[PDB]
Amino acid sequence: QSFQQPCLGCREFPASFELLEGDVPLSCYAGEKRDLGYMLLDIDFERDMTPLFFKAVMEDDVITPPSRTSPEVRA
């Protein structure tokens, strides 16, 4: 059940979803490290819709962005 159909960025791209109750399976780049550079983190609506950025590095097919609520990120 859902409030509305999810989308992959644009409404014309519906997304199928499922809930997991197990371990994360292996992935294509599980054994690789790859750099992506800076990318968007989130938008600050309080600061009249001001964006934020962070440095992204993909390793072992997992990503760990910093906390977007942290004040030091807001700086």
Residue 38 contacts RNA per CB under 7 A = no
Of the pair 4, 64, the CB lying nearest RNA is at 4
Residue 9 contacts RNA per CB under 7 A = yes
φ/ψ (deg, to 5) at 32: -125, 160
Residue 18 contacts RNA per CB under 7 A = no
Return the range that interacts with RNA (CB under 7 A); candidates 9-17, 18-26, 30-38, 59-67: 9-17
Residue 3 contacts RNA per CB under 7 A = yes
For the residues of 1-69, what is the DSSP string, one character each? --SS--BSSSTTSB-------SPPPP-TTTT-EEEEEEEEEEEETTTTSEEEEEEEEEETTB--PPPTT
Interface positions with RNA (CB under 7 A): 3, 6-11, 15, 40, 43, 45, 51
